[PDB]
Symmetry: C3
Subunit: 245 residues, 3 copies
Amino acid sequence: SHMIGITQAEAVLTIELQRPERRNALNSQLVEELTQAIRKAGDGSARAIVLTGQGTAFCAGADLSGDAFAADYPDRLIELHKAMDASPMPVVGAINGPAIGAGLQLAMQCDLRVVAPDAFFQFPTSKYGLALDNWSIRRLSSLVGHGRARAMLLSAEKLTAEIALHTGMANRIGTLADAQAWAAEIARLAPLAIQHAKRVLNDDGAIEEAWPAHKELFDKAWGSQDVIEAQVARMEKRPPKFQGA
Amino acid sequence: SHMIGITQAEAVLTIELQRPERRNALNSQLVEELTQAIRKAGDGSARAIVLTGQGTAFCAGADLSGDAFAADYPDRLIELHKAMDASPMPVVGAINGPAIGAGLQLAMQCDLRVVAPDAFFQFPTSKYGLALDNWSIRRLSSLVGHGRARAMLLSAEKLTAEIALHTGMANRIGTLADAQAWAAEIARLAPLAIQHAKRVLNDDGAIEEAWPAHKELFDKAWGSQDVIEAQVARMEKRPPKFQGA
Amino acid sequence: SHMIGITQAEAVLTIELQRPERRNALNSQLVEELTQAIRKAGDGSARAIVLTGQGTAFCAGADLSGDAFAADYPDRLIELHKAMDASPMPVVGAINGPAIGAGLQLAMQCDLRVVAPDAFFQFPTSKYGLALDNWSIRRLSSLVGHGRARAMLLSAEKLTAEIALHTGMANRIGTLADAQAWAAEIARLAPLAIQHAKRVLNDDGAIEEAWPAHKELFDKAWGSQDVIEAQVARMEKRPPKFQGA
Ligand SMILES: CCc1ccc([C@H]2C[C@@H](C(F)(F)F)n3ncc(C(=O)O)c3N2)cc1
Ligand SMILES: CCc1ccc([C@H]2C[C@@H](C(F)(F)F)n3ncc(C(=O)O)c3N2)cc1
Ligand SMILES: CCc1ccc([C@H]2C[C@@H](C(F)(F)F)n3ncc(C(=O)O)c3N2)cc1
């Protein structure tokens, strides 16, 4: 079938994630469809995009079961981010609920964010033994400030909507309709001005290749027994006993 | 005549923009006079500068009509910024009212900012089809946070004095007299300490040459029909109809 | 004797500065002992460190009298920072009171900060004619925002606990016990995830070699008569009369 919905009102294209049965957690199909929707957003008269989730969550992470193309997922995910980064259109994220893990990455790749009052943002990587790419860390630091980024990454701290507004992670607190109204205003602005500013802003240095030591630690985390222990402990409904290996 | 006023009380030199008939919008003469005032600020016993505007605005942008040396304006403007950056003296901006476009650039080149309660900051570039230099974008991101910088640049969002205080764009809310009092305290501090910190702070990376793609998009914006359309639409008192070309 | 105390409750190691007779101001001995404590923190079962000061101050700066190894102090201080940066353990600073000069540097080298309501942070370098290393300036800018960093460095502005919470310099307002409770939660998280994120965060660019002009100005400040004048004026209980030389 299809895992997203696409609609257009005048010059604003709204893309809605439609996998609420997994709180919009990503898989290969959802990512592929999103990539195509972004790439084709300029086929009509659209001048702005609103990206949002169906139901209570914006995107709760990733869920690859039972994804017949799960091995392709990580690469397709990178392709989606490249498509958003390269789009001449501004993407307004209507963050309607929790944005967690891959969902937080996706929210951060939007150009602007309108956040529902009860939404929150989180990287629970420290609870699962995983490591992030450098852009995720740099862009987060730019949006919440270095100090809060340390807490989010080292302790799995949740960022509330209210604090997101304080830091600028949220540009506004509001609803999907609020996001669509703002997008309508943006769609009336000069496209080449928007395109230039978006490119320069995205080229602030957040797009960064992992240093050699970063890659070493990244691979050590991903190949560790602790990653397995976090998964087993969850299935057995008990606290994980991590060993640092 | 002259488009600025210069006065000194003890060790504080106050420079006032005096083109209130255009809300202190810059031209070649005003820029040249400001550059000279900054360069000569150390001829006396001055240890701090206060920069401010006459009337309701700090600086509402640029107005080159009918400037006999308008072709020279962009280069002279860069020279002014170089002079402020190179000055061993700390410049306290008493931002007495709106700082818009070139006025926001000028405010950001000050070392510290004391902002009047009703002042605001804005880059309305997206309403006019124009593109900014990279420093304007980087220094703005550092002062308001990356998230708010995206909104200011992509949607022409105004930054209020209250929010400026929250982000650190405003170091204090207050008046010209308040700025002059603080400058007096600063003038009693150790000059070589101030000089070192100013140089290192300004060398945070904001002074950045445009990347090749940035230059391409910058020139595309400036040479576009949309830039003309914004001007014509204003003269005809109607909404612009931008085409992205 | 010893100038620090070291205790462990389960998986949290608490290191306490114990020179309250100088408000925990550093010297060669205190720095050496701290370095050893950090290096050996992983000899037991510890997974997190809490760093704190005895009495009313976290660390009020440096006091090298009468330190028989004072000439070694600057190098040993750098060694301490290297040890904290290299530690696989997250260091939670329980900033129990003022963190000034070397004390602010030490607080900033912690991975997370829990700050007492009456604590404050300050670099009074401008009152003493001194210059800082580039990391101190970059890490401060990342924690309080560029705008407040300008005020702290150019005017010796104090950062209150409340404003520290706003900017993310403080992750939480609270007590030593509060810090120890949070550290206990962190000690249950996956160590390799924490290690990766800490390394990437610390490699944001704050660790920066002084540019040639920065070194020139740094040496000019440190060798100036104004540095001597600040010290003499203090001893004579009068305002300093700085000359910029
Ligand atoms: C060029 C625009 C851009 C920006 C950020 C990224 C991030 C996305 C992020 C995500 F998980 F979301 F896929 N990611 N994951 C791994 C990588 C990588 O580059 O190795 C990587 N790169 C990819 C592309
Ligand atoms: C070295 C200190 C410094 C810092 C920033 C700038 C900015 C100013 C800014 C302004 F419009 F204000 F003139 N500007 N405009 C164009 C450029 C440029 O460098 O191409 C440019 N460079 C110029 C000089
Ligand atoms: C590699 C981790 C790291 C990070 C910052 C520093 C700072 C500490 C700081 C302090 F005063 F605290 F010792 N400092 N002082 C001088 C220097 C230097 O590098 O020249 C310098 N370097 C040293 C080491």
